[PDB]
Design an enzyme around this catalytic site. Structure first.
Site, mmCIF file in Angstrom:
data_model
loop_
_atom_site.group_PDB
_atom_site.id
_atom_site.type_symbol
_atom_site.label_atom_id
_atom_site.label_comp_id
_atom_site.label_asym_id
_atom_site.label_seq_id
_atom_site.Cartn_x
_atom_site.Cartn_y
_atom_site.Cartn_z
ATOM 1 C CG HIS A 91 -0.133 0.025 2.456
ATOM 2 N ND1 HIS A 91 0.302 -1.102 3.089
ATOM 3 C CD2 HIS A 91 0.358 1.052 3.172
ATOM 4 C CE1 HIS A 91 0.993 -0.743 4.128
ATOM 5 N NE2 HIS A 91 1.014 0.515 4.189
ATOM 6 C CG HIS A 93 1.341 5.683 4.173
ATOM 7 N ND1 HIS A 93 0.300 5.586 5.116
ATOM 8 C CD2 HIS A 93 1.980 4.504 4.185
ATOM 9 C CE1 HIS A 93 0.419 4.421 5.731
ATOM 10 N NE2 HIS A 93 1.407 3.702 5.153
ATOM 11 C CG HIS A 116 4.888 1.411 3.946
ATOM 12 N ND1 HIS A 116 4.142 2.140 4.861
ATOM 13 C CD2 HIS A 116 6.035 2.101 3.777
ATOM 14 C CE1 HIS A 116 4.855 3.181 5.268
ATOM 15 N NE2 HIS A 116 6.024 3.187 4.627
ATOM 16 C CB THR A 196 -2.199 2.237 10.444
ATOM 17 O OG1 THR A 196 -1.945 0.857 10.169
ATOM 18 C CG2 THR A 196 -1.900 3.021 9.189
HETATM 19 ZN ZN ZN Z 1 2.174 1.832 5.474
#
Ligand code: ZN
Length: 256
Positions: A91, A93, A116, A196
């Site tokens: 994913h 950011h 990531h 997260t």
């Molecule tokens: Zn991440």
């Protein structure tokens, strides 16, 4: 109900996840003049030739490309790692603007985005067990800058229309994550956490020195996603990054 807004964003996370204030939180600023060259680190081994992508999902925080991790198809080993880590998902950011979006910073420099690639330690048998162990995860972090298009990202950009809102998923087979890597595998590494909730301190971070370049049009398409579900008022999925956390009692090592 955690998020990235004024009322549920990173400053709020510690109330549900007190480890938010722990001793090995991520991300961090990478001070390139403080990081020590560790001539004993091994070359990173990225073996993604048999990677099997399944699907892409908007989870209301980012979009995840999920992989079949039921055998050793796509693995990371070497560098600072003992044993074999299996790719489960990647994913990103990203920011509202090209001057912010990355989680890690380099001498306080923010990149437009950060990729990531999430891997888990096969010695723990499954991802859910691995996140409860201090060496359970290896996350390969790759900065994105705005310049020329990344051809290997365009297949991701093209499907984002189909997963605009929270809870939407799509089939995403035969995606080759090798197309997201820069030329150099020179890296920084430090022990840290999920960035997260639940912010578990289970991650060996491996952050590549060389960013990849993506086009302004590619990043714009990430910014057109929604944090909200279908039929709710539109909140653009932008600024889904956690700011740099205190390094506390940690050494960042350089492979180079
Ligand atoms: Zn991440």
């Amino acid at each position: 109900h955690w998020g990235y807004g004024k009322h549920n964003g990173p400053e709020h996370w510690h109330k549900d996840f007190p480890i938010a204030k722990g001793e090995r939180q991520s991300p961090v600023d990478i001070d390139t003049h403080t990081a020590k060259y560790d001539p004993s680190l091994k070359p990173l081994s990225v073996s993604y030739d048999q990677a099997t992508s399944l699907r892409i999902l908007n989870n209301g925080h980012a979009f995840n490309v999920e992989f079949d991790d039921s055998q050793d198809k796509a693995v990371l080993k070497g560098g600072p790692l003992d044993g074999t880590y299996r790719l489960i998902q990647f994913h990103f950011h990203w920011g509202s603007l090209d001057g912010q979006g990355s989680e890690h910073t380099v001498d306080k420099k923010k990149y437009a985005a950060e990729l990531h690639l999430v891997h888990w330690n096969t010695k723990y048998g499954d991802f859910g067990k691995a996140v409860q162990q201090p060496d359970g995860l290896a996350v390969l972090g790759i900065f994105l800058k705005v310049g020329s298009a990344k051809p290997g990202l365009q297949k991701v950009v093209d499907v984002l229309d189909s997963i605009k809102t929270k809870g939407k998923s799509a089939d995403f087979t035969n995606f080759d994550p090798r197309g997201l890597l820069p030329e150099s595998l020179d890296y920084w590494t430090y022990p840290g956490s999920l960035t997260t909730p639940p912010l578990l301190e289970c991650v060996t971070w491996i952050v590549l020195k060389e960013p990849i370049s993506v086009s302004s049009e590619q990043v714009l398409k990430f910014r057109k996603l929604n944090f909200n579900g279908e039929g709710e008022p539109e909140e653009l999925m932008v600024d889904n990054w956690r700011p740099a956390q205190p390094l506390k009692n940690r050494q960042i090592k350089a492979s180079f």
